[PDB]
Symmetry: D2
């Protein structure tokens, strides 16, 4: 009618209603239909959104994810719900159950990883639990007792197996591992992926999201699915991926997230008297990946570049990933001021046509910008949340507040959209996306 927005209490109520509605029992789907399984970094954001509602159930969410952790420490990016269809590529296509010696016996999972935001969710659970009294603190502390080792194995696998040369950057073998498979970041690396005899398949994602402008193309999916074939042919063996994979990139945004997560997990380890050797290793990785991120940065603007390991070239694109060094710190004073100027100026948050003062996934002034197309332009509430939380942690209280305020204004339609059109504010992707509700729940306090 005259304004279809919701009040803060109405919005918080609807966000919690959604998150419980996507709960299958011990895992929350990332969306009702498009993503009807557990996703790894979504599950961390879901736990953040559950923490104000039930510390016990937030802990269950991470327990379920960690129960699917591979024998070598990798957290796979999908934990499939038993008997659930409607998502492709599904467990039959990954075939990790029959081909991956490290895959868990009692869960079906994908064969690739996703960004290590999980320590941040643990910190939010602990902060909520400490406000709730003894029995709730005991729940969160029992979770640490039970899962500290698994969290360490996850970070160690990243540091040792995806940074084999100790360059302080994480190597990815699939664009899906960045969280942003169709980002302009990866276009030139995908151009060097030439599928062989790719087994026939039918997409499911664009049956649910039928507007073709909102999802990747068939040609992109052919390359996404071919990379799976290459992993399967070597049975997902870490030692063989560098020799066979047609896509090998160092992801500077994933790397900065890992730097932050190591520092966060290290602080948790000190607070809860975890083994000193573990805390020492976490701080070492935090510093190594901070330095690895800074090494990539533009000498004028501070913007961070990804790296194509096969082509041996810096990937220079105009996306939100450029702001990786803002997450983890480490830039010299003058270059971080330049990077913040880029963030706030007309190429990103200050673009004059934006409905909200938020960070588009791709700069609206880039030739690669597509305002509807998944990670090629739309504004993602999950990125707003991650940037706002990391900015508050840098001490940039007012910058963080402004992102939270605009994110709540954007979410006040109650669509809990996966992403939003940057100019019109139209909800895009899946509606009722779990991590969009989780951002709103964490923000509203």
């Amino acid at each position: 009618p005259h304004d279809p927005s919701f009040t803060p209490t109405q919005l918080a109520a609807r966000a919690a209603y959604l998150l419980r509605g996507n709960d299958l029992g011990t895992m929350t789907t990332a969306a009702p239909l498009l993503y009807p399984h557990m996703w790894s970094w979504d599950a961390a954001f879901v736990a953040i959104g559950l923490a104000p509602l039930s510390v016990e159930r937030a802990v269950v969410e991470l327990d379920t994810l960690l129960s699917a952790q591979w024998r070598n420490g990798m957290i796979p990016h999908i934990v499939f719900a038993n008997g659930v269809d409607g998502y492709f590529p599904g467990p039959a296509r990954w075939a990790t159950a029959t081909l991956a010696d490290n895959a868990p016996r009692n869960r079906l999972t994908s064969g690739i990883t996703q960004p290590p935001v999980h320590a941040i969710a643990v910190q939010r659970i602990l902060e909520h639990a400490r406000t709730r009294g003894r029995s709730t603190r005991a729940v969160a502390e029992a979770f640490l007792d039970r899962r500290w080792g698994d969290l360490m194995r996850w970070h160690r696998w990243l540091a040792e197996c995806r940074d084999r040369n100790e360059r302080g950057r994480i190597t990815l073998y699939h664009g899906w591992e960045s969280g942003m498979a169709n980002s302009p970041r990866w276009d030139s690396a995908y151009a060097n992926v030439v599928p062989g005899k790719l087994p026939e398949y039918q997409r499911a994602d664009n049956v649910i999201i039928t507007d073709p402008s909102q999802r990747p193309s068939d040609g992109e999916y052919d390359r996404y699915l071919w990379l799976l074939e290459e992993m399967k042919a070597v049975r997902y063996d870490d030692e063989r991926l560098p020799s066979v994979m047609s896509f090998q990139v160092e992801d500077v945004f994933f790397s900065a997230i890992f730097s932050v997560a190591c520092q966060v997990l290290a602080e948790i380890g000190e607070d809860y008297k975890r083994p000193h050797a573990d805390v020492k290793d976490l701080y070492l990785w935090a510093e190594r990946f901070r330095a690895g991120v800074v090494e990539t940065t533009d000498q004028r603007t501070g913007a961070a570049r990804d790296f194509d390991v096969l082509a041996e070239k810096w990937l220079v694109t105009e996306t939100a990933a450029q702001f990786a060094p803002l997450l983890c710190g480490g830039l010299p004073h003058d270059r971080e001021r330049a990077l913040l100027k880029l963030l706030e100026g007309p190429r990103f948050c200050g673009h004059p046509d934006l409905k909200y003062g938020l960070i588009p996934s791709t700069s609206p002034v880039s030739r690669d910008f597509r305002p509807r197309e998944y990670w090629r332009g739309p504004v993602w509430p999950v990125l707003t949340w991650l940037f706002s939380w990391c900015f508050a942690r840098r001490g940039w209280a007012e910058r963080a507040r402004l992102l939270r305020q605009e994110g709540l204004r954007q979410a006040s339609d109650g669509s809990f959209a996966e992403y939003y059109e940057p100019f019109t504010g139209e909800p895009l992707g899946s509606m009722q996306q779990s991590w969009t509700a989780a951002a709103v729940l964490d923000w509203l306090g």
Copy 2:
């Protein structure tokens, strides 16, 4: 810790989280374990609590309840969840499936009724829907098209079959039909219930609520269960209940609720162009039961009395039911002022030991008062909500606001208790009670 209360957004979020958690699919249980089925007047309050979250799902809740309506128009007070145990008396004990010719074929139900608050829930659904735009208005209007006749049959059954002498008061054959089975209101009528050979049974309610001070006694349950035997022996036939039932009371609070509900449903009928004959009948019943309520009232204080049909005597007790005339109107000016003075004074809301300025189910100064014992004293959030809504509808904006404010203060522990100790505020009865969350959700706006 220093204050374990929740903010308004945290509380609204937790209330919605609870209501979705008690949703079995198309019905919401009244509580997780103590009441693991659909109850009739609880379902109306659940629909009120769902309306800010999903008009579609609020409508589903009433559709499910009305699908269990008996062939003669009676809405039974329990609609059992298929395959669910843990509540006594359960479907086997009622035996309406085999003995009640009017019971629905496709639902298991109890054999008695409960207060007709359902029109009030329809009004709240309609008010929410009108703020939400065309598609949501169409959902609520389709519900009226589908269920107006059933709602009329429900009111007609009450008016014709439970007020056979057109006295403007509803006759009950079980204390459970009042919603308040152990109220001091009914003690002298129960004293005239003498069980014959009562089939052996085991309670379930005091397995879940083990503190004996919070639930009725075994002796009370023996009388509750014997009344079932009397109904079963005549196969729940309306025409035979007056000849056989050992408990027959005119419930003045139920009667006042019915007066209000008739007026509310009549206004809905006018607004949505329902049949004129129906609207005329609803207004006639609204006036008849208003007059029936006023006829019972104390000539000094305005307090309303129940009536024992078998003993032919006015039941004079000191409970919240005395305030029935405040709900429906009709008292002369001077006597309603006296009744409000009683409400606000030291026998009820103004009692000096109360933690919150709320209406205890029994006056703390009555010899019958028990601060823990179900309907014999505790403060019930559902009654706070009903009184506050009816008071706002009388035009008593500040009185209604004060009840809402104290009700939210009391509920801010997030226990969503079934009822609360009036002096200490201790949560009692079931935790996570659906209609307590619904009151909070409606209030918070």
Copy 3:
């Protein structure tokens, strides 16, 4: 930036900041410059806005107004601030200090009256005081002791001297007494006001509001000032005014306000044990003016008409005054439904081009509608407040809530404008208008 609206806490703070800034010490100006004096019904609304801030200062505001009461009971519509210029007509033009035998010795005032909303402010003060404990209740009760007699003499002067024929409607001798001097309501009465030798004058209002479209015309001010000459010629004598005034109208909106105010003051009198004869007179007047308002109404639509006493003619116009019967009650059921349909429909709150669901001062479809011009069309926050408060007192809780919600949305720019353009929401008239801040303060709670 992207959103120049204030949060509820920011807006409440700015509203209180404004009200204290317009405080001269013991009186609050109606605006900083346009209305740099105390106005009568503005002072009632200011007291309502002060009640949540300081019951003591709210009481002072009404004490200051009543200290200016005329010896016959009239509350004049302007109490001039000593030594303050910049408003015309000012004290020298009214000349009540030399001509009006009933004017107070110690205050400079105008010589006409304004609507009796004062009892409503007393109710709000009492309601706040009762939530704030004994010392604050004592302040408000002491005000009742000190000023009950003055309030009675105000209501009695209205009932006996402006309703000489006991028709239950208030006669006015100036459009300014209606609050709405350029309302289309008065156009045909003004058309029979033929000025004689009118002494020269210079307007001050359109020096401060320079946009000519927002204020009445010079021709209209000539008639406003000529009526002052007619009053002055008979020394403002109540007994002579009917013989000489060229403007004599029965104001149905003023009459409905008076009915409400009498009923409100009667209930205060009952609650605080004021003399029985006063309470009885107040209820008698409430009923008399309720009936007088109903007598004006169209038998189909319920719309209330004003009456031109000199022409002996019903004044049929399409302004917010038509809704007078909604404030005081009394209409038959069918007629009130019809009037509510007019209010909510496309001629008023339902007009498709309105920015906010609010009541414009003149219907946008009326030929007399002017969207910028004072009382000929703009939306007035003070009317929104008065309608919402009276609607809640009728029991129309949702209708009242919707007006409050839209009024807060409109006021969220922080301009505290006198009135707003109905289609664009542009702030018009004076900024920093005291009764717009008071409405916001009362609403926000």
Copy 4:
């Protein structure tokens, strides 16, 4: 009644009402009667509280303070209101108008200084102005143009004249300069202050605060006033004070504030293109005083010590000043963790008897603790605000949020007390204290 607390909107409104009520025109008194003049660091906090209400008036507050700046750059701690009495020592006792060659011609002031929080207020003004559009940004930028040089001269006077030896700590000649004249911090320095012939005087502070337990003793005031005699004897000459003053201490809390203020002002200078040499000096001083603060700290616990320059002795006490290093940064990792453990533990925020999780001015377990006595124990809302703002700037978002939440809980009585009893929450000192209202206004947002 049952709950005398105010809602967030009511509290924000009352806080703004108070601040406007203490406004004399161009200066805001620190309290209505106890402190009926402008105080220096109070005026910074008042400007912070005014920024959400009127950027223009917030700027006026700092313009008025800086118009009283001494010719050598010192901002004096009191700017007296013309013709206002009731505070002692007043202008005649200081005699700066006749004795101090650097005192301003057009203002009566004291002859000592106070902590340099002023840059923090400038930052908050700028942050508000940037959310309010171009005309308001122009007001704040014009203030920078007009007053940047004065702010530089204030910081330069501190750095060059109160840190003559470039030790990175500020020397004080009076306990009043610390803000906390009766803090246990100064007891051993005061013990070596031996008054000579002290001219007779009559205290005013304990006429307004009559409870002797809330204010310093007569013996303490004799020493405070004797230090004024020593300053007066040398005409307040910066060059002579070290030779004559019986009280000379390095204040580590003042020093940490100065470090923060320099860094804040440097970032403002970079953002608004102020002279490079100024920005460079500001960063140099920020680093120098950060290091000077760290040099004072216990190597185990991180607790910061003050220094008695005359005794050449570290002053080891248990007050909130120990936490100075948390404001400015610089501690080694292990030492800062230890200091945070002290802050959160049973000697401060964790003490089991505190009503609120807040920082008392003296540790409750210290032998010097007095729960009512000014800076010897009470909880000061202004310190809560300063710690919370600095903590958020460190990146400690949850720690800052908890202080704000508890500070708002404590302030929800609406007394706006100067300080509060740490165990009972009783309001103490002056009511209606301006910087307590300003803290609430900044927090509520």
